[PDB]
Design a binder for this molecule. Structure first.
Ligand SMILES: *[C@@H]1O[C@H](CO)[C@@H](O[C@@H]2O[C@H](CO)[C@@H](O[C@@H]3O[C@H](CO)[C@@H](O)[C@H](O[C@H]4O[C@H](CO)[C@@H](O)[C@H](O)[C@@H]4O)[C@@H]3O)[C@H](O)[C@H]2NC(C)=O)[C@H](O)[C@H]1NC(C)=O
Ligand code: CL
Length: 199
């Protein structure tokens, strides 16, 4: 129960334990009250091809600013959230964090006219240059082609780290990948809920 709250997964960048950060960079600002990411990690999240993963989102050339913003926010969420304990599964990762409907929907809307070449990003890239390239015969086409629904986008872009939830925002039953810093973190209560109910 309490074991699952206010912890950081054991992945390669995460802080051992969450704690306030005097400064986080831009999109990661929302987590600065209590974060699993360092300043350096928050900065690296914003680089053209983040050195955190060396996965290029620009593999089809056309990735729009509004689309990339959602992806940077996703990195901040993964790297900074102290509220993922309940979905930590075995050295750890996260599986099927329930993202609210609006988080998936807007992400999808803002990425429609960007281009990718694959639906299942978890693997099957041409990796020869040190960054991933589209494999042989994988056509660059709009995100709406490879991710027909918001749910496809959320789930497949991050190797099943996230699960698109039928629940909406402020329902207490799903997590937001980003939130306005003024408002305070809506995900604390949600993690508490899953923790208390033995999942
Ligand atoms: C994503 O890709 C980037 C780019 O390759 C990668 O960052 C690079 O990591 C390598 C190794 O981690 C860095 O190389 C080191 O550079 C320092 C100088 O800053 C050297 O002192 C190091 O020398 C020691 O280590 C070598 C083996 O790595 C030994 O052969 C050598 O004898 C020394 O003992 C070493 O060369 C490189 O500087 C960075 N490059 C950049 C631009 O930062 C990043 O790590 C990748 N991300 C992930 C998650 O792997
Ligand atoms: Cl959070």
């Amino acid at each position: 129960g309490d074991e699952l709250l206010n912890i950081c997964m054991n992945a390669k960048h995460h802080k051992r334990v969450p704690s306030p950060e005097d400064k986080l960079y831009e999109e990661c600002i929302p987590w600065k009250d209590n974060a699993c990411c360092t300043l350096t990690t928050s900065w690296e999240a914003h680089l053209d091809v983040s050195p955190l993963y060396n996965f290029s989102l620009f593999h089809c050339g056309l990735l729009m600013p509004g689309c990339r913003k959602h992806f940077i926010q996703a990195i901040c969420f993964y790297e900074c959230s102290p509220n993922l304990g309940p979905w930590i599964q075995p050295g750890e990762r996260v599986v099927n964090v329930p993202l609210c409907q609006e988080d998936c929907e807007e992400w999808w809307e803002d990425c429609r006219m960007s281009y990718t070449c694959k639906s299942n990003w978890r693997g099957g890239w041409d990796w020869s240059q040190g960054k991933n390239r589209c494999p042989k015969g994988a056509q660059c086409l709009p995100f709406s082609h490879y991710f027909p629904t918001p749910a496809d986008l959320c789930e497949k872009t991050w190797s099943n780290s996230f699960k698109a939830s039928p629940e909406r925002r402020n329902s207490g039953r799903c997590l937001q990948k980003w939130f306005e810093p003024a408002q305070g973190n809506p995900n604390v209560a949600v993690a508490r809920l899953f923790a208390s109910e033995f999942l």
